[PDB]
Amino acid sequence: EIPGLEVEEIDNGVFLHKSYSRVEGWGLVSSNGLVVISGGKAFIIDTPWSESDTEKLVDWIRSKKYELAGSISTHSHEDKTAGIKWLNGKSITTYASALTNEILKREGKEQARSSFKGNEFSLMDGFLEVYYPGGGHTIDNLVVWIPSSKILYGGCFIRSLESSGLGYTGEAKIDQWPQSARNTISKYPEAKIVVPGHGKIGDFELLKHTKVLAEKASNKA
Numbered sequence: 521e522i523p524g525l526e527v528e529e530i531d532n533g534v535f536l537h538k539s540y541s542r543v544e545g546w547g548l549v550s551s552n553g554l555v556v557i558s559g560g561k562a563f564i565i566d567t568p569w570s571e572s573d574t575e576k577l578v579d580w581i582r583s584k585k586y587e588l589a590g591s592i593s594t595h596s597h598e599d600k601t602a603g604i605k606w607l608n609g610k611s612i613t614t615y616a617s618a619l620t621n622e623i624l625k626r627e628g629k630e631q632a633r634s635s636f637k638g639n640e641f642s643l644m645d646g647f648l649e650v651y652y653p654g655g656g657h658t659i660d661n662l663v664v665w666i667p668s669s670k671i672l673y674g675g676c677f678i679r680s681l682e683s684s685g686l687g688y689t690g691e692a693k694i695d696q697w698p699q700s701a702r703n704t705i706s707k708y709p710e711a712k713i714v715v716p717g718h719g720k721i722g723d724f725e726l727l728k729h730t731k732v733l734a735e736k737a738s739n740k741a
């Protein structure tokens with residue numbers, strides 16, 4: 521049925537992975553995550569949308585002779601957490617925020633093995649910096665900053681420039697999203713690449729674009 525995992529280089533040691541699902545009401549949808557390398561170690565930012573494709577990603581990483589260090593999921597939705605169970609099973613360390621894990625638990629879902637409280641966190645010897653900007657797409661959505669290459673992974677908190685609206689807003693914090701977007705613009709003024717949870721990567725404009733969309737939705741509402 522659905523097309524398979526894609527892996528694409530977007531900067532030295534930074535790979536965009538793209539996986540697919542059908543979603544009722546939305547049709548065939550793709551989802552982004554990253555694989556980030558430091559010193560031969562690979563860190564997954566968001567799992568693919570399926571167990572199969574999570575295994576494919578891990579196999580790709582091993583075939584490139586990288587050491588797999590772990591994964592972080594940037595909110596609870598299945599497009600970013602589908603592979604947590606499989607990874608757990610392989611004793612690959614999975615991370616999420618404590619809040620994200622509570623949502624997963626409340627919904628009867630597999631939790632990440634490690635979690636963190638607080639609005640910031642760092643992984644892989646500080647090569648990844650994690651930040652909670654406040655609610656937007658969801659109450660728990662996180663972003664991940666790669667300071668060395670000034671790449672911001674926005675996840676579904678950040679919309680692609682081709683999007684006229686906010687996407688799936690059934691669990692959004694529409695009224696909080698503008699200030700959260702503003703927080704992210706203030707924190708990452710020099711971001712060079714911004715990676716949305718869905719769609720095409722771009723530059724810092726994705727942050728401005730998402731703030732406008734959030735403001736528009738909040739005002740309309």
Ligand SMILES: [Cl-]
Nearest residue numbers: 549687688718
């Ligand atoms: Cl969408």
Ligand SMILES: [Cl-]
Nearest residue numbers: 708709710711
């Ligand atoms: Cl900066």
Ligand SMILES: [Zn+2]
Nearest residue numbers: 595597657676
């Ligand atoms: Zn989501």
Ligand SMILES: [Zn+2]
Nearest residue numbers: 597599676717
């Ligand atoms: Zn999403």
Ligand SMILES: [Zn+2]
Nearest residue numbers: 728729730732
């Ligand atoms: Zn715009």
